[PDB]
Amino acid sequence: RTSVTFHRPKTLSKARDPKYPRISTPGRNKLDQYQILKYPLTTESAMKKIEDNNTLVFIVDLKADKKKIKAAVKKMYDIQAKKVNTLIRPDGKKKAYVKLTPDYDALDVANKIGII
Amino acid sequence: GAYKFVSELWRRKQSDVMRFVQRVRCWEYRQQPAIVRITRPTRPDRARRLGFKAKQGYVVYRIRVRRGGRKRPVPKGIVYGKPKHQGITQLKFQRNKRSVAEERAGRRLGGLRVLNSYWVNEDSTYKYFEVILVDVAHSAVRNDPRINWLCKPVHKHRELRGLTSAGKKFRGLRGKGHRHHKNRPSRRATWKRNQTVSLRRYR
Amino acid sequence: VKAGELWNKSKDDLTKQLAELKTELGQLRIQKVASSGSKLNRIHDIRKSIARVLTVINAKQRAQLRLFYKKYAPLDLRAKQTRAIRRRLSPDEKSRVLEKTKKRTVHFPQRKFAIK
Amino acid sequence: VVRIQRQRRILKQRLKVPPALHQFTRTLDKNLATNLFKMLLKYRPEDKAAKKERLLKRAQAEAKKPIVVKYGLNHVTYLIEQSKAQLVVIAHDVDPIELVVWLPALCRKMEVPYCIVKGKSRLGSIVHKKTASVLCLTTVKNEDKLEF
Amino acid sequence: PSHKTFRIKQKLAKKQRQNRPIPYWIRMRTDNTIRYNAKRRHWRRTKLGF
RNA sequence: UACUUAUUCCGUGGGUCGGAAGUUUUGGCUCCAAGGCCGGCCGAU
RNA sequence: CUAAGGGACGGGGUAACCCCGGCAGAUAGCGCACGCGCCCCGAAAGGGAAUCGGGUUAAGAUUUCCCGAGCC
RNA sequence: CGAGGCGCCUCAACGAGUCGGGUUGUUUGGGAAUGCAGCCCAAAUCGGGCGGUAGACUCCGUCCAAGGCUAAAU
RNA sequence: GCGACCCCAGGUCAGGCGGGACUACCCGCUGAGUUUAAGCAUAUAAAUAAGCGGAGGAGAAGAAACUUACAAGGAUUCCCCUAGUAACGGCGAGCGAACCGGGAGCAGCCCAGCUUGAGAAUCGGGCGGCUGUGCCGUCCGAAUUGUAGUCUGGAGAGGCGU
Ligand SMILES: [K+]
Ligand SMILES: [K+]
Ligand SMILES: [K+]
Ligand SMILES: [K+]
Ligand SMILES: [K+]
Ligand SMILES: [Mg+2]
Ligand SMILES: [Mg+2]
Ligand SMILES: [Mg+2]
Ligand SMILES: [Mg+2]
Ligand SMILES: [Mg+2]
Ligand SMILES: [Mg+2]
Ligand SMILES: [Mg+2]
Ligand SMILES: [Mg+2]
Ligand SMILES: [Mg+2]
Ligand SMILES: [Mg+2]
Ligand SMILES: [Mg+2]
Ligand SMILES: [Mg+2]
Ligand SMILES: [Mg+2]
Ligand SMILES: [Mg+2]
Ligand SMILES: [Mg+2]
Ligand SMILES: [Mg+2]
Ligand SMILES: [Mg+2]
Ligand SMILES: [Mg+2]
Ligand SMILES: [Mg+2]
Ligand SMILES: [Mg+2]
Ligand SMILES: [Mg+2]
Ligand SMILES: [Mg+2]
Ligand SMILES: [Mg+2]
Ligand SMILES: [Mg+2]
Ligand SMILES: [Mg+2]
Ligand SMILES: [Mg+2]
Ligand SMILES: [Mg+2]
Ligand SMILES: [Mg+2]
Ligand SMILES: [Mg+2]
Ligand SMILES: [Mg+2]
Ligand SMILES: [Mg+2]
Ligand SMILES: [Mg+2]
Ligand SMILES: [Mg+2]
Ligand SMILES: [Mg+2]
Ligand SMILES: [Mg+2]
Q: What keywords does the record list, in alphabetical order (chain E) (predicted)?
């Protein structure tokens, strides 16, 4: 005992291997792409962003962060987002500014969706 | 049968044998926390009569409580009232020390149920009791028809309602007939019965 | 639509129906923000169909799990009662008495009698 | 926990020990103890498997009075007062010491040979338990009459 | 202030939605007694103490 | 009148206590052993 | 991140609500078997990774959008 | 489709810092002290607790505490 | 050094239990004053309000260490009567039960102690099986510092017979 100080010794601890699962339902992704992308904005200010900055405006879930948004637009419309700017509006909803990469034309995407 | 020899010895607390054995134990309890789990009753013969059995589900705890009376806990010894209620120091708690010990144990161990307790030691400032508790979730208790009653919901926290042996002592239920009739079903029940103004419909 | 038909379909077919109705509720939410007059009542019809499909899928899952577990049951599959009912002694435990009591019932039970 | 157990040993050394407790300090000699225990091993009770095997062997026919050590404080105490104990072996370290502190007086009063040996756990091992705390011999085999 | 906690902003959004006139078609229902909102608040009067 | 273990107080990262045997230098650096003898002992009673 | 300070495990008190943090309690871990070992909250004026110029709206950007040029 | 009952005849174990006593406080209709509580003292087994005035002695009547459960009438 | 035990430590170990809420009734603690006394301090208000806890469908109490003084009764609870009585009380203001008797409703039981020693005969868990609130098998553990059974003063053990 070269130390005059006693320390608690290191003891083995096993991991949890339960005899039954506490949850048996698999657990389903309730924040899927349809919850993330609710609907696009069609205001006059929102329509200007389409042809001026290659940008689509969406109303998004409050629980959706920027990473889920760009993954959602890719799985919904097969387009690539260059960047996503988000805000929470004074009405309490979340609004996303989705700028598409060059070689994606938001006006063509806007025509396919139906907002134009 | 050796239990009679043990019981007879514990009646001679002032012998040299019991004084030495109690003095060493009293010192050791002083170096421990006030609520300590023990693997075995110190007085097995006294535990048998109070209901303890050497089975899985019966646990024993040693409880240390302070001795003396109950000083009135008012901010400076200052009472705002008539001189009959101005006393501070020489007042006494209505519950005994044995019930205080098993009530501390019950609050600390909410998953268990107090069976009863017995006296263990004292020096000048502390009294020591061992409290018997039952794990009413264990199958050994749930399958024993002599302790099954403790698993029923009407016996929850009986140490807090004065239903243990110590509680019956301070409730005045350790006697019968006159000198004790005011304590049944309870003193407050007796008082309410004697306050009633019975106004029958044919009077 | 026609939950009776939904109960016939397999799990791959049921999730394929779930995907179609999600795509179609999204196309309506786009229509709702732009313009229409009779596509608006399809929202209620289709939203209820999504609920209908998810109910059938869920009810099949639980029935399957209840069959696969009939050792220890998962906590969500256990019989839910009041908390006090779950803490009760069994009838075997409530009806158990010791030998000295079982003997007196054997030798001296209450009799059937009458007064002349 | 280590400090409390070490101070407990020192306090018992400093405090005047009454004779009825001080007598447990005098233990059987090492040579005698190894003789007695090697003889107590001959009369060990059967283990759980052996008792099961003996039950099966009887069931195959469908015995004899065994000679084994007796143990258990209540049972040993009963034998001594009945004048059937031929030798009593008492452990020196029964933690509630009031369990066995009167035992040498009872054995001496009933004219029964007794000794105090080191180790309740050693006595427990003979009877396939832990901490037997007292052993009794009532009968010995004729092959051991002279040694006993 | 401009510096807002999220929980304060979420409550302010709900109070913004709640002070609207009642829809006109509500007054046309079969057994209707509702006349006005009875819970309109103007910011200059009747502050909401948050 | 003496004792020390109860009790009380003080100190420390509880770091040389009891018995026996056999570094004053200048405002600098100093740890995890060289060495000897058979993982082991002395060096470090 | 810490400040004045606040809460708080164990322990102590208390009929309980609750009141006490230095009273030291195997302090619950850190590097490469081996080695070491003296909790959180609390500042949009304290400490502190890193951005500039020009343009743009009815309402934004006194550095968030656009152009260009950098940095961590 | 063994055990219990009863008739007759030598053992017979029964709960301790508990009872009880003093004192202090509180409570009661309980008055030389109704219950309870703190502290001090501290049991017995031809014994113990009561018989509403404190004490001693002789008889008599009556119970057996200090472990546990228990429907109904309310 | 291998071992047995005792006491203790650490586990997101396997399976489990607890905390809070509700207020009419019920159980435990703690605890005033206004007021009355034509003042006021004991007394009264009141062993009440407030305060802190604990349950249930009821709770609590309960089978005499009870009454009585009789020709004796015979667990608890509640009602009527006892009774504004005995008693208590600056014996002032005031306060204040119980026994008997009559009703409602009735029910008595379980342990510890000596009591297997020709055999811990007891219990829990893991696993497997099944006839599944449980039963059986096997393996581990608890327990002799005592699980089971017998016994509870009304007795009972032992001995002898229906
Ligand atoms: K800052
Ligand atoms: K007895
Ligand atoms: K008194
Ligand atoms: K008498
Ligand atoms: K089994
Ligand atoms: Mg932002
Ligand atoms: Mg204003
Ligand atoms: Mg207001
Ligand atoms: Mg920090
Ligand atoms: Mg600070
Ligand atoms: Mg604390
Ligand atoms: Mg901070
Ligand atoms: Mg700053
Ligand atoms: Mg501006
Ligand atoms: Mg007293
Ligand atoms: Mg007094
Ligand atoms: Mg009081
Ligand atoms: Mg008299
Ligand atoms: Mg008794
Ligand atoms: Mg009793
Ligand atoms: Mg009861
Ligand atoms: Mg009724
Ligand atoms: Mg676990
Ligand atoms: Mg609660
Ligand atoms: Mg007045
Ligand atoms: Mg007046
Ligand atoms: Mg006045
Ligand atoms: Mg109240
Ligand atoms: Mg309920
Ligand atoms: Mg009850
Ligand atoms: Mg009786
Ligand atoms: Mg009566
Ligand atoms: Mg009259
Ligand atoms: Mg009164
Ligand atoms: Mg009455
Ligand atoms: Mg009557
Ligand atoms: Mg154990
Ligand atoms: Mg037995
Ligand atoms: Mg019998
Ligand atoms: Mg007979």
A: Ribonucleoprotein, Ribosomal protein
Whole-number Å distance between alpha carbons of A36 and A64: 6
Q: Which of D33, D26, D51, D40 is nearest to D125 (CA)?
A: D40
Distance between the alpha carbon (CA) of B180 and the C1' atom of H32, Å: 21
Kindly report the nearest CA distance between residue D31 and chain B, in angstroms: 31
State the amino acid at position A47 in one-letter form: M
Is residue B64 within 8 Å of residue B126, measured between CB atoms? Answer: yes
- The alpha-carbon radius of gyration of chain A (Å, integer) is 24
Query: Which one, of A28, A25, A27, A19, lies nearest residue C66 by Cα?
Result: A25
Do residues D25 and D109 make contact, with C-beta atoms less than 8 angstroms apart?
no
Nearest Cβ partner for D4 among B16, B20, B28: B28
Nucleotides, chain H, CB distance < 7 Å: 3-4, 14-19, 24-26, 28-30, 34-40, 42-44, 52, 65-70
For A:49-108, CB contacts with E below 8 A are 88-92
* Cited resolution, angstroms: 2.8
Per DSSP, B60 falls in state E
Element holding D107 (H helix, E strand):
helix D103-109
Both structure tokens of E42? 């103007």
* Closest CA relative to residue E18, chosen from E48, E39, E47: E39
The answer to whether residues D2 and B26 touch, using CB atoms and an 8 Å cutoff, is no
Please give the structure tokens belonging to residue E11.
């409550």
Q: What angle do CA D114, D115, D118 make, to 5 degrees?
A: 150
Partners of residue B38 on adjacent β-strands: B60
- Alpha-carbon distance values, B186 to B155, B166, B190, B198, D83 (Å): 18, 16, 6, 20, 54
Residue B36 DSSP class: E
- Closest to D138 (Cα-Cα) out of D65, D76, D74, D90: D76
Q: How far apart are CA B39 and CA A7, in angstroms?
A: 26
Chain C from 8 to 47: CB within 8 A of any A CB? 22, 25-27, 29-34
Q: How far apart are CA E9 and CA A88, in angstroms?
A: 9
